[PDB]
């Protein structure tokens, strides 16, 4: 079994009761420098200084963080394509990623 980063749903409409939970299940022995970064699917710098998961992803192998996708400065488009990315802090090596999540803005 390999390291995985899955999500409750890969499509979220803004202003719904249904929230998006991010389930990470990493088989690698994790470092306390690990994190999940929330970046827009954008043809730009692969650093993509963007949103992220805070405390709770601080080098934990497996767990979940539920999050309300609210229409803020990050969510301006009619359909915001985002992706969560669990990086292993050592070398900043991408350990796991979610499919491109379609955040729809009605």
Coordinates of N, CA and C in Angstrom, one line a residue:
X1 N 0.8 -1.2 0.0 CA 0.0 0.0 0.0 C 0.9 1.3 0.0
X2 N 0.6 2.2 -0.9 CA 1.3 3.5 -1.0 C 0.5 4.6 -0.3
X3 N 1.2 5.7 -0.1 CA 0.7 6.9 0.5 C -0.4 7.6 -0.4
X4 N -1.5 7.9 0.3 CA -2.7 8.4 -0.4 C -3.2 9.7 0.2
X5 N -3.8 10.5 -0.6 CA -4.5 11.7 -0.2 C -5.9 11.8 -0.9
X6 N -6.9 11.4 -0.2 CA -8.3 11.3 -0.7 C -9.1 12.4 -0.1
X7 N -10.3 12.6 -0.7 CA -11.2 13.7 -0.3 C -12.7 13.2 -0.4
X8 N -13.6 13.7 0.5 CA -15.0 13.2 0.6 C -15.7 13.3 -0.7
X9 N -15.4 14.4 -1.4 CA -16.0 14.7 -2.8 C -15.0 15.6 -3.5
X10 N -14.8 15.4 -4.8 CA -13.9 16.2 -5.7 C -14.6 17.2 -6.5
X11 N -15.9 17.5 -6.0 CA -16.7 18.6 -6.6 C -17.5 19.2 -5.4
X12 N -17.4 20.6 -5.3 CA -18.0 21.3 -4.2 C -18.6 22.6 -4.7
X13 N -19.9 22.8 -4.5 CA -20.7 24.0 -4.9 C -20.7 25.0 -3.7
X14 N -20.4 26.3 -3.9 CA -20.3 27.3 -2.9 C -21.7 27.7 -2.3
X15 N -21.9 27.6 -1.0 CA -23.1 27.9 -0.4 C -24.0 26.7 -0.1
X16 N -23.4 25.5 -0.1 CA -24.1 24.2 0.3 C -23.7 23.8 1.7
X17 N -24.6 22.9 2.3 CA -24.4 22.4 3.6 C -23.3 21.3 3.7
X18 N -23.1 20.7 2.5 CA -22.1 19.6 2.4 C -20.7 20.2 2.4
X19 N -19.9 19.7 3.4 CA -18.5 20.2 3.6 C -17.5 19.2 3.0
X20 N -16.3 19.6 2.7 CA -15.3 18.8 2.1 C -14.2 18.3 3.2
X21 N -14.2 17.0 3.4 CA -13.2 16.4 4.4 C -12.0 15.9 3.6
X22 N -10.8 16.1 4.1 CA -9.5 15.7 3.5 C -8.9 14.6 4.3
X23 N -9.0 13.3 3.8 CA -8.5 12.1 4.4 C -7.1 11.8 3.9
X24 N -6.0 11.9 4.7 CA -4.7 11.5 4.3 C -4.4 10.2 5.0
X25 N -3.8 9.2 4.2 CA -3.3 7.9 4.7 C -1.9 7.6 4.1
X26 N -0.9 8.1 4.8 CA 0.5 8.0 4.3 C 1.2 6.8 5.0
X27 N 1.8 5.9 4.2 CA 2.5 4.7 4.7 C 4.0 5.0 5.1
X28 N 4.5 6.1 4.5 CA 5.8 6.6 4.8 C 5.9 7.1 6.3
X29 N 7.0 6.8 7.0 CA 7.2 7.4 8.3 C 7.5 8.9 8.2
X30 N 6.5 9.6 8.6 CA 6.3 11.1 8.4 C 7.2 11.9 9.3
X31 N 7.6 13.1 8.8 CA 8.5 14.0 9.6 C 7.5 15.1 10.1
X32 N 7.8 15.7 11.3 CA 7.0 16.8 11.8 C 7.0 18.1 10.9
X33 N 7.8 18.1 9.9 CA 7.8 19.2 8.9 C 6.9 19.0 7.7
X34 N 6.1 17.9 7.8 CA 5.1 17.5 6.7 C 3.9 18.5 6.8
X35 N 3.2 18.6 5.6 CA 2.0 19.5 5.5 C 1.2 19.1 4.3
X36 N -0.1 19.5 4.2 CA -0.9 19.5 3.0 C -1.0 21.0 2.5
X37 N -0.6 21.2 1.3 CA -0.8 22.5 0.6 C -2.0 22.5 -0.3
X38 N -2.8 23.5 -0.3 CA -4.0 23.7 -1.1 C -3.6 24.7 -2.2
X39 N -3.4 24.2 -3.4 CA -2.9 25.0 -4.5 C -4.0 24.9 -5.7
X40 N -4.2 26.1 -6.4 CA -5.0 26.1 -7.6 C -4.3 25.4 -8.8
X41 N -5.0 24.5 -9.5 CA -4.6 24.0 -10.8 C -4.4 25.1 -11.7
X42 N -3.2 25.6 -11.8 CA -2.8 26.9 -12.5 C -1.5 26.6 -13.2
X43 N -1.4 27.0 -14.5 CA -0.1 27.0 -15.3 C 0.7 28.2 -14.9
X44 N 1.5 28.0 -13.8 CA 2.3 29.1 -13.2 C 3.5 28.4 -12.4
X45 N 4.3 29.2 -11.6 CA 5.3 28.7 -10.7 C 4.8 27.5 -9.9
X46 N 5.4 26.3 -10.0 CA 5.0 25.0 -9.3 C 5.1 25.2 -7.7
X47 N 5.6 26.3 -7.2 CA 5.6 26.7 -5.8 C 4.2 27.0 -5.4
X48 N 3.5 27.7 -6.3 CA 2.1 28.1 -6.1 C 1.7 28.6 -4.7
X49 N 2.4 29.7 -4.3 CA 2.1 30.3 -2.9 C 0.6 30.7 -2.8
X50 N -0.1 29.8 -2.1 CA -1.6 29.7 -2.1 C -2.0 29.2 -0.7
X51 N -3.2 28.5 -0.6 CA -3.8 28.2 0.7 C -3.2 26.8 1.2
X52 N -3.6 26.4 2.4 CA -3.0 25.2 3.0 C -3.8 24.7 4.2
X53 N -3.6 23.4 4.5 CA -4.1 22.8 5.8 C -3.1 23.2 6.9
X54 N -3.7 23.7 8.0 CA -3.0 24.1 9.2 C -2.8 22.9 10.2
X55 N -2.4 23.2 11.4 CA -2.2 22.2 12.5 C -3.2 21.0 12.5
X56 N -2.6 19.8 12.5 CA -3.3 18.6 12.3 C -2.7 17.8 11.2
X57 N -2.0 18.4 10.3 CA -1.2 17.8 9.2 C 0.3 17.9 9.5
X58 N 0.7 18.1 10.8 CA 2.0 18.5 11.2 C 2.9 17.2 11.3
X59 N 3.0 16.4 10.3 CA 3.6 15.1 10.4 C 2.8 14.0 11.1
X60 N 1.6 13.8 10.5 CA 0.7 12.7 11.0 C 0.5 11.8 9.7
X61 N 0.8 10.5 9.9 CA 0.6 9.5 8.9 C -0.8 9.4 8.3
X62 N -1.8 9.2 9.1 CA -3.2 9.1 8.7 C -4.1 9.9 9.7
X63 N -5.1 10.6 9.0 CA -6.1 11.4 9.8 C -7.0 12.1 8.8
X64 N -7.8 13.0 9.3 CA -8.7 13.9 8.4 C -8.9 15.3 8.9
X65 N -9.1 16.3 8.0 CA -9.4 17.6 8.3 C -10.6 18.1 7.4
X66 N -11.8 18.2 8.1 CA -13.0 18.8 7.4 C -12.8 20.3 7.2
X67 N -13.3 20.8 6.1 CA -13.1 22.2 5.8 C -14.3 22.7 4.9
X68 N -14.8 23.8 5.3 CA -15.8 24.6 4.5 C -15.1 25.4 3.5
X69 N -15.4 25.1 2.2 CA -14.8 26.0 1.1 C -15.8 27.2 1.0
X70 N -15.3 28.3 1.6 CA -16.1 29.6 1.6 C -15.6 30.5 0.4
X71 N -16.5 31.3 -0.2 CA -16.2 32.2 -1.3 C -15.3 33.4 -0.9
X72 N -14.0 33.2 -0.8 CA -13.0 34.2 -0.3 C -12.1 34.6 -1.5
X73 N -10.9 35.2 -1.2 CA -10.0 35.8 -2.2 C -9.4 34.7 -3.1
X74 N -9.4 33.5 -2.6 CA -8.9 32.3 -3.3 C -9.9 31.8 -4.3
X75 N -11.2 32.0 -4.0 CA -12.3 31.4 -4.8 C -13.1 32.6 -5.5
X76 N -12.6 33.0 -6.7 CA -13.1 34.2 -7.5 C -13.7 33.7 -8.8
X77 N -13.3 32.5 -9.3 CA -13.7 32.0 -10.6 C -15.1 31.4 -10.6
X78 N -15.8 31.2 -11.8 CA -17.1 30.5 -11.8 C -16.9 29.0 -11.5
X79 N -15.7 28.4 -11.7 CA -15.2 27.1 -11.3 C -13.7 27.1 -11.0
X80 N -13.5 27.0 -9.7 CA -12.1 27.0 -9.2 C -11.6 25.6 -9.1
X81 N -10.6 25.2 -9.9 CA -10.0 23.9 -9.9 C -8.8 24.0 -8.9
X82 N -9.0 23.3 -7.7 CA -7.9 23.2 -6.7 C -7.5 21.8 -6.5
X83 N -6.4 21.6 -5.7 CA -5.9 20.3 -5.3 C -5.1 20.4 -4.0
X84 N -5.4 19.4 -3.1 CA -4.6 19.3 -1.9 C -3.4 18.4 -2.2
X85 N -2.3 18.7 -1.6 CA -1.0 18.0 -1.9 C -0.2 17.8 -0.6
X86 N -0.2 16.6 -0.1 CA 0.6 16.2 1.1 C 2.1 16.1 0.7
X87 N 2.9 17.1 1.1 CA 4.3 17.1 0.9 C 5.0 16.5 2.2
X88 N 6.0 15.6 2.0 CA 6.9 15.1 3.1 C 8.0 16.2 3.2
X89 N 8.0 16.9 4.4 CA 8.9 18.0 4.7 C 10.3 17.8 4.4
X90 N 10.9 16.6 4.5 CA 12.2 16.3 4.0 C 12.3 16.4 2.5
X91 N 13.1 17.5 2.0 CA 13.3 17.8 0.6 C 12.0 18.5 0.0
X92 N 10.9 18.6 0.8 CA 9.6 19.1 0.2 C 9.1 18.1 -0.9
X93 N 9.3 16.8 -0.7 CA 9.0 15.8 -1.7 C 7.5 15.5 -1.6
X94 N 6.8 15.6 -2.8 CA 5.4 15.4 -2.9 C 5.0 13.9 -2.7
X95 N 4.4 13.6 -1.5 CA 4.2 12.3 -1.0 C 2.8 11.8 -1.4
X96 N 1.8 12.7 -1.6 CA 0.4 12.3 -1.9 C -0.3 13.6 -2.5
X97 N -1.4 13.3 -3.3 CA -2.2 14.4 -4.0 C -3.6 13.9 -4.2
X98 N -4.6 14.9 -4.1 CA -6.0 14.7 -4.5 C -6.1 15.0 -6.0
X99 N -7.0 14.3 -6.7 CA -7.5 14.8 -8.1 C -8.0 16.2 -8.0
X100 N -8.0 16.9 -9.2 CA -8.4 18.3 -9.4 C -9.9 18.5 -9.0
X101 N -10.1 19.1 -7.9 CA -11.4 19.3 -7.3 C -12.1 20.6 -7.9
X102 N -13.2 20.4 -8.5 CA -14.0 21.4 -9.1 C -14.9 22.1 -8.1
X103 N -14.4 23.3 -7.6 CA -15.2 24.1 -6.7 C -16.1 25.1 -7.6
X104 N -17.4 24.8 -7.6 CA -18.3 25.6 -8.5 C -18.8 26.8 -7.7
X105 N -18.8 28.0 -8.3 CA -19.3 29.2 -7.7 C -20.6 29.7 -8.4
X106 N -21.8 29.4 -7.8 CA -23.1 29.8 -8.4 C -23.3 31.3 -8.3

